[PDB]
Amino acid sequence: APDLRGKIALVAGATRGAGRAIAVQLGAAGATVYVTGRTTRSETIEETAELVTEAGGTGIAVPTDHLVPEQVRALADRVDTEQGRLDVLVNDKKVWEHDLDAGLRLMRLGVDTHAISSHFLLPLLVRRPGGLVVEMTDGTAAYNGSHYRNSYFYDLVKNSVLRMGYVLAHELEPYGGTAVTLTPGWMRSEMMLETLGVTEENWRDALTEVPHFCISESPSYVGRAVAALAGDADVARWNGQSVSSGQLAQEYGFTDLDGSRPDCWRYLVEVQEAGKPADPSGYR
Amino acid sequence: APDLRGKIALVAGATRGAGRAIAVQLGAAGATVYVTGRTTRETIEETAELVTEAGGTGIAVPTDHLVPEQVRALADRVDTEQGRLDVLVNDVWGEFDKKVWEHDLDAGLRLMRLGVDTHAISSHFLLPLLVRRPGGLVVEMTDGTAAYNGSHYRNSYFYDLVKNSVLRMGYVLAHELEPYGGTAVTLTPGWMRSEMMLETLGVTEENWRDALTEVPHFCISESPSYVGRAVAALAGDADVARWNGQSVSSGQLAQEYGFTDLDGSRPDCWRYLVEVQEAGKPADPSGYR
């Protein structure tokens, strides 16, 4: 397990989902984790901060509207003020049938938030060599390169975030910084679980409803992937790359909480898209 | 030369640059071209007038492509006047030395909205008429090919994201159009001798090589009409669907279709940049145009 004691991390959008689990596993590795989000006081950013500390780290919730630049500027001044450093930064319809106002808003919320974040927080990170940026997305470059993702606006956002890691990787290298774009697999998120009417303790009950859900992973999986990167002294070998939680589980050797290693994106192509029946053998 | 007589085309953002040159070469191939832009009476009307003299029909529709109501009215007009849309070209566009945190943020966000949102609004309102019948063609204009951009950082954070988003737009639209018999590609010009480029170097088109002393690698440049002839070759290709979803360049299509620039050459900008300029070799167009 990575020893991240003394490290300063910030997870933008950590109220729920991968962001919370990422912040929590960073705290479990011993880091101080700034966690941001709009929903305040549990399904709150404060609850996220409390989970980071409970895990053995220090979680500091900073409520932020990441589309409001002055709020992200204030966020960046705060980490500098309190810490003086930042080691890890974590960020059915045709196009003409889709609702246009929603699609444009989706692209602004999914892309502009990352750009505003990098503009204000990257100066502190490149202040010393060794900083790491992880841009979170849905899918790998290899998968998204040959697959349309759900909708026009969704697809554009997720592939923009893929490019953001390549772009930042070129901008950060002269400072000794690293940027990657990371995706989870099929997450057993709090939202996903309630949608299937199950708890984490009894998640395979849903396999009758969704048989291919047998490849799913807990949110802590991609959280341990980030911790492995932030603890990697030669993490710069990944600079500019698109990576997945399952790919990094094979490289670093961590497991999900249940000890398995789901490999979602190979399963989707070789089994599910291949017309084969749901069968996790050899994929977790 | 392609015979596009009877074809109805629309070029979004056709006041100048590739968009004007594309609209003109479509009219020279016989098309009726709707040309849009904000700049009216170096105007969109001038673009329409140039389409007509070239042997076609240019119809200027001043449009703010960031205002959906205006783009919807534009789409209703083509249906009202023509009832069909065969070719749609998207060329709507809005700090080369700066990091994302050094760049001006408000400008960068405005750059991404003007360069990405305008294309999405355009596809939302105009694609229904285009997919009404098979054989429609969508051309999303960009800077660079997927092969080049995949291994090259492009100018700035915001610029890079915009141009690579439009590349993805061609792939995405290719999936949405296939059941309708429609085709989408993303096309880039080379280094265009645009009106802006020519004035920046203090030259005219008639004497453009005078600039080689100050910019030697400009020897690979092309006139705007080159990429215009690439669009016309696609729109005239009965088997254009073989390109569906692909990223293409003006020089690559010159090799495939056999057209030339106005001066009879075939600049291959993106191979030249990698094999000569980025390789440290001196500027020498031999074998690249």
Numbering used by the authors:
A (entry chain A): 9 to 49, 58 to 107, 119 to 311
B (entry chain D): 9 to 49, 59 to 111, 117 to 311
Sentences from the paper on this structure:
As a family of DNA damaging genotoxins, THIQ antibiotics exhibit remarkably potent DNA alkylating activity through the departure of hydroxy group in hemiaminal moiety followed by an attack of N-2 of guanine in GC-rich region. Here we discover a self-defense strategy featuring with reductive inactivation of hemiaminal pharmacophore by short-chain dehydrogenases/reductases (SDRs) NapW and homW, which are integrated with the naphthyridinomycin biosynthetic pathway. When the cofactor NADPH is replaced by NADH, the enzymatic efficiency was dramatically decreased. These results strongly demonstrate that NapW and homW functionally catalyze the reductive inactivation of the highly reactive iminium species, which implied that the two SDR proteins may participate in self-protection from endogenous DNA alkylation. Collectively, these results unambiguously supported our proposal that the SDRs NapW and homW axiomatically endow cells resistance to NDM for self-protection.
The structure of NapW contains a typical Rossmann fold with seven β sheets embraced by α helices, which is the key feature of SDR family proteins for binding cofactors. The binding of cofactor NADP+ enables loop 47–58 and loop 107–119, which are too flexible to observe in apo-NapW structure, adopt stable conformation and are clearly observed.
